[PDB]
Scaffold this motif. Structure first.
Motif, PDB file in Angstrom:
ATOM      1  N   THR A  67      -6.732  -6.948  11.096  1.00  0.00           N
ATOM      2  CA  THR A  67      -5.942  -5.787  10.682  1.00  0.00           C
ATOM      3  C   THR A  67      -5.525  -4.895  11.859  1.00  0.00           C
ATOM      4  OG1 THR A  67      -7.372  -5.811   8.678  1.00  0.00           O
ATOM      5  CG2 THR A  67      -5.930  -3.878   8.961  1.00  0.00           C
ATOM      6  N   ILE A  68      -4.369  -4.241  11.743  1.00  0.00           N
ATOM      7  CA  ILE A  68      -3.922  -3.216  12.667  1.00  0.00           C
ATOM      8  C   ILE A  68      -4.184  -1.928  11.859  1.00  0.00           C
ATOM      9  CG2 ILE A  68      -2.009  -2.217  14.036  1.00  0.00           C
ATOM     10  CD1 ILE A  68      -0.734  -5.173  13.941  1.00  0.00           C
ATOM     11  N   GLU A  69      -3.489  -1.736  10.718  1.00  0.00           N
ATOM     12  CA  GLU A  69      -3.741  -0.587   9.859  1.00  0.00           C
ATOM     13  C   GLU A  69      -3.073  -0.767   8.499  1.00  0.00           C
ATOM     14  OE1 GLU A  69      -3.083   4.008  10.470  1.00  0.00           O
ATOM     15  OE2 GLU A  69      -4.672   3.316  11.834  1.00  0.00           O
ATOM     16  N   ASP A  70      -3.876  -1.029   7.455  1.00  0.00           N
ATOM     17  CA  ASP A  70      -3.337  -1.225   6.112  1.00  0.00           C
ATOM     18  C   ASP A  70      -3.651  -0.048   5.189  1.00  0.00           C
ATOM     19  OD1 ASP A  70      -2.362  -3.710   6.918  1.00  0.00           O
ATOM     20  OD2 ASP A  70      -3.880  -4.894   5.849  1.00  0.00           O
ATOM     21  N   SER A  71      -2.818   0.131   4.167  1.00  0.00           N
ATOM     22  CA  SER A  71      -2.996   1.173   3.168  1.00  0.00           C
ATOM     23  C   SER A  71      -3.071   0.575   1.770  1.00  0.00           C
ATOM     24  CB  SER A  71      -1.837   2.158   3.222  1.00  0.00           C
ATOM     25  OG  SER A  71      -1.929   2.961   4.382  1.00  0.00           O
ATOM     26  N   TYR A  72      -3.961   1.108   0.936  1.00  0.00           N
ATOM     27  CA  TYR A  72      -4.163   0.702  -0.455  1.00  0.00           C
ATOM     28  C   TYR A  72      -4.212   1.970  -1.310  1.00  0.00           C
ATOM     29  CZ  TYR A  72      -5.659  -3.956   1.180  1.00  0.00           C
ATOM     30  OH  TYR A  72      -5.725  -5.187   1.772  1.00  0.00           O
ATOM     31  N   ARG A  73      -3.645   1.927  -2.498  1.00  0.00           N
ATOM     32  CA  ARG A  73      -3.645   3.054  -3.416  1.00  0.00           C
ATOM     33  C   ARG A  73      -4.018   2.531  -4.783  1.00  0.00           C
ATOM     34  NH1 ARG A  73      -1.348   7.930  -2.013  1.00  0.00           N
ATOM     35  NH2 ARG A  73      -0.608   8.413  -4.126  1.00  0.00           N
ATOM     36  N   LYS A  74      -5.007   3.138  -5.439  1.00  0.00           N
ATOM     37  CA  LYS A  74      -5.394   2.678  -6.769  1.00  0.00           C
ATOM     38  C   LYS A  74      -6.002   3.759  -7.625  1.00  0.00           C
ATOM     39  CE  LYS A  74      -7.676  -0.834  -9.415  1.00  0.00           C
ATOM     40  NZ  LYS A  74      -8.623  -1.963  -9.416  1.00  0.00           N
ATOM     41  N   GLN A  75      -5.556   3.860  -8.874  1.00  0.00           N
ATOM     42  CA  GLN A  75      -6.074   4.833  -9.814  1.00  0.00           C
ATOM     43  C   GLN A  75      -7.278   4.213 -10.509  1.00  0.00           C
ATOM     44  OE1 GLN A  75      -3.195   6.863 -12.326  1.00  0.00           O
ATOM     45  NE2 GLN A  75      -4.468   6.349 -14.119  1.00  0.00           N
ATOM     46  N   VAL A  76      -8.439   4.864 -10.420  1.00  0.00           N
ATOM     47  CA  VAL A  76      -9.702   4.387 -10.980  1.00  0.00           C
ATOM     48  C   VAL A  76     -10.392   5.546 -11.752  1.00  0.00           C
ATOM     49  CG1 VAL A  76      -9.918   2.804  -8.975  1.00  0.00           C
ATOM     50  CG2 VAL A  76     -11.142   4.998  -8.985  1.00  0.00           C
ATOM     51  N   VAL A  77     -11.451   5.250 -12.509  1.00  0.00           N
ATOM     52  CA  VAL A  77     -12.190   6.284 -13.225  1.00  0.00           C
ATOM     53  C   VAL A  77     -13.606   6.293 -12.637  1.00  0.00           C
ATOM     54  CG1 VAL A  77     -13.031   7.082 -15.482  1.00  0.00           C
ATOM     55  CG2 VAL A  77     -10.729   6.112 -15.308  1.00  0.00           C
TER      56      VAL A  77
END
Ligand SMILES: Nc1nc2c(ncn2[C@@H]2O[C@H](COP(=O)(O)OP(=O)(O)OP(=O)(O)O)[C@@H](O)[C@H]2O)c(=O)[nH]1
Ligand SMILES: [Mg+2]
Lengths: 15, 170
Positions: free
Chosen positions: B37-47
């Motif tokens: 990896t160089i720089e990754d982004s993840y977005r996730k709605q969780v409870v």
């Protein structure tokens, strides 16, 4: 959603 | 309360399993290949604990040639998952340097952090659980052993980091 380094847009990874 | 964004940053030496842990939490899949990896982004709605939360995860580079990017992500990051591999004792020593750099650029002794000992599925280890628990105990941060391969401790590591951020906000 995921955005790799250098990507312009986000793609789905949770479907 | 409203659904808030939590800015999680995953740090650690190259090949410890930072991407494999994030991918396992996001979509329940284990990546066998090593895609540096160089720089990754993840977005996730969780409870988490009955509260809808938006996880913004920055999966960073462990390769030393990308070290110059650290100051920017450490300033913006809100909580940090400090990952080392239990079969890599150099990664355990490096994880202490990450902990120190985070405290310097953020200028705070109590930045939300969770120590993560990854690759717990492996039959042998070079960093004993007592060594890691001793290190996290001295800094007053949680310690969780994980395996991105079996999913053991994965949800616990990221959700404990969210809980650490919740207390830090107050
Ligand atoms: N046995 C086992 N292998 C793992 C585990 N986590 C990661 N790996 C393997 O370790 C290698 C590197 O994992 P990555 O998640 O790509 O490592 P990383 O820390 O993101 O590496 P950089 O992006 O270069 O910093 C891959 O071949 C993974 O399959 C785990 O818990 N168990
Ligand atoms: Mg990676």
């Amino acid at each position: 959603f995921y955005r790799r380094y250098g990507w312009r847009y986000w793609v789905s990874v949770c479907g | 309360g409203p659904m808030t964004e939590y800015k999680l940053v995953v740090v650690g030496a190259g090949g410890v399993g930072k991407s494999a842990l994030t991918i396992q939490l996001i979509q329940n899949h284990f990546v066998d290949e090593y895609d540096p990896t160089i720089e990754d982004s993840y977005r996730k709605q969780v409870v988490i604990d009955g509260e809808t939360s938006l996880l913004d995860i920055l999966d960073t580079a462990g390769r030393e040639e990308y070290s110059a990017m650290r100051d920017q992500y450490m300033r913006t990051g809100e909580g940090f998952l400090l990952v080392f591999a239990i079969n890599n004792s150099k990664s355990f020593a490096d994880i202490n340097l990450y902990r120190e750099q985070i405290k310097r650029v953020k200028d705070s002794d109590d930045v939300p952090m969770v120590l993560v000992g990854n690759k717990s599925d492996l039959p042998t280890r070079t960093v004993d659980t007592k060594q890691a628990h001793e290190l996290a105990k001295s800094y007053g941060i949680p310690f969780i052993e994980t395996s991105a391969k079996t999913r053991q401790g994965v949800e616990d590591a990221f959700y404990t980091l969210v809980r650490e951020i919740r207390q830090y906000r107050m």
